[PDB]
Enzyme design. Structure first.
Site, mmCIF file in Angstrom:
data_model
loop_
_atom_site.group_PDB
_atom_site.id
_atom_site.type_symbol
_atom_site.label_atom_id
_atom_site.label_comp_id
_atom_site.label_asym_id
_atom_site.label_seq_id
_atom_site.Cartn_x
_atom_site.Cartn_y
_atom_site.Cartn_z
ATOM 1 C CG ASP A 92 -0.262 -0.173 2.508
ATOM 2 O OD1 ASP A 92 0.956 0.069 2.545
ATOM 3 O OD2 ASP A 92 -0.923 -0.595 3.461
ATOM 4 C CG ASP A 109 -3.559 -1.916 7.215
ATOM 5 O OD1 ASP A 109 -2.444 -1.457 6.923
ATOM 6 O OD2 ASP A 109 -3.799 -2.585 8.215
ATOM 7 C CB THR A 110 -1.249 -4.204 2.093
ATOM 8 O OG1 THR A 110 -0.300 -3.135 2.281
ATOM 9 C CG2 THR A 110 -2.104 -4.000 0.853
ATOM 10 C CD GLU A 134 3.628 -3.208 7.858
ATOM 11 O OE1 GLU A 134 4.678 -3.027 7.264
ATOM 12 O OE2 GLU A 134 2.794 -2.320 8.049
ATOM 13 N NE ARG A 137 3.172 6.805 4.960
ATOM 14 C CZ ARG A 137 2.651 5.747 5.562
ATOM 15 N NH1 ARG A 137 3.109 4.536 5.285
ATOM 16 N NH2 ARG A 137 1.643 5.900 6.399
ATOM 17 N NE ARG A 171 -0.521 3.052 4.497
ATOM 18 C CZ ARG A 171 -1.743 2.515 4.475
ATOM 19 N NH1 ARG A 171 -2.517 2.638 3.399
ATOM 20 N NH2 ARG A 171 -2.156 1.782 5.499
HETATM 21 C C1 LIG Z 1 -3.804 5.510 5.221
HETATM 22 C C2 LIG Z 1 -3.435 6.571 6.213
HETATM 23 C C3 LIG Z 1 -2.430 6.296 7.137
HETATM 24 N N1 LIG Z 1 -2.086 7.242 8.009
HETATM 25 C C4 LIG Z 1 -1.096 7.041 9.058
HETATM 26 C C5 LIG Z 1 -1.897 6.552 10.246
HETATM 27 C C6 LIG Z 1 -1.002 5.546 10.917
HETATM 28 O O1 LIG Z 1 -0.323 6.167 12.052
HETATM 29 P P1 LIG Z 1 0.727 5.283 12.918
HETATM 30 O O2 LIG Z 1 1.985 4.934 12.172
HETATM 31 O O3 LIG Z 1 0.946 6.314 13.947
HETATM 32 O O4 LIG Z 1 0.066 3.988 13.268
HETATM 33 C C7 LIG Z 1 -0.081 5.082 9.771
HETATM 34 C C8 LIG Z 1 -0.509 3.789 9.085
HETATM 35 O O5 LIG Z 1 0.246 3.548 7.904
HETATM 36 P P2 LIG Z 1 0.953 2.153 7.556
HETATM 37 O O6 LIG Z 1 -0.151 1.098 7.418
HETATM 38 O O7 LIG Z 1 1.600 2.386 6.206
HETATM 39 O O8 LIG Z 1 1.862 1.924 8.696
HETATM 40 O O9 LIG Z 1 -0.108 6.058 8.776
HETATM 41 C C9 LIG Z 1 -2.764 8.508 7.992
HETATM 42 O O10 LIG Z 1 -2.416 9.364 8.819
HETATM 43 N N2 LIG Z 1 -3.691 8.843 7.093
HETATM 44 C C10 LIG Z 1 -4.084 7.923 6.203
HETATM 45 O O11 LIG Z 1 -4.969 8.222 5.386
HETATM 46 CA CA LIG Z 2 0.169 -1.469 5.822
#
Ligand SMILES: Cc1cn([C@H]2C[C@H](OP(=O)(O)O)[C@@H](COP(=O)(O)O)O2)c(=O)[nH]c1=O
Ligand SMILES: [Ca+2]
Length: 129
Positions: A15, A34-35, A37, A75, A29
């Site tokens: 993702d 959510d994919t 890891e 991102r 992103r």
């Molecule tokens: C998809 C998405 C993720 N994120 C942030 C929230 C999560 O915070 P935390 O890292 O604090 O958990 C993290 C999840 O992404 P990943 O699944 O790539 O880790 O990225 C956003 O802020 N907005 C979004 O739209």
């Molecule tokens: Ca992910």
């Protein structure tokens, strides 16, 4: 919502993808998914799936939603299209992603993706097996 051009720099995982957008390298992103890891179940399959999709596209498009366009990690947050097919939706449809991180104001394709998830669930695809 508007489709904007971009070119693949590099596949990253299920993702996230590195794209060149308005001439600048940026990690994107995928909104609303959510994919797993790489180190988790279906993680390698999600990475492979997205990688194939972006690497075979002759045309990559970035579609920002109405809200926030970069996250706290810097991102980009977008719907990513590969020759007109939305990667976000496609991962969900194949049960390689769950619908997730649905924040208000950045949720235009929410219903579309839930519909895709419902059908992936029905078919016990991948994450749902
Ligand atoms: C998809 C998405 C993720 N994120 C942030 C929230 C999560 O915070 P935390 O890292 O604090 O958990 C993290 C999840 O992404 P990943 O699944 O790539 O880790 O990225 C956003 O802020 N907005 C979004 O739209
Ligand atoms: Ca992910």
């Amino acid at each position: 919502l508007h489709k904007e051009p971009a070119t693949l720099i590099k596949a990253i995982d299920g993702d996230t993808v590195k794209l060149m957008y308005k001439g600048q390298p940026m990690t994107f992103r995928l909104l609303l998914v959510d994919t797993p890891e790489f180190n988790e179940k279906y993680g390698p399959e999600a990475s492979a799936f997205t990688k194939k999709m972006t690497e075979n596209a002759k045309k990559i498009e970035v579609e920002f939603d109405k809200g926030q366009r970069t996250d706290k990690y810097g991102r980009g947050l977008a719907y990513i299209y590969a020759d007109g097919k939305m990667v976000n939706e496609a991962l969900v449809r194949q049960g390689l992603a769950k619908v997730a991180y649905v924040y208000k104001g950045n949720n235009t394709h929410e219903q579309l993706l839930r519909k895709a998830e419902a059908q992936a669930k029905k078919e016990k695809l991948n994450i749902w097996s």
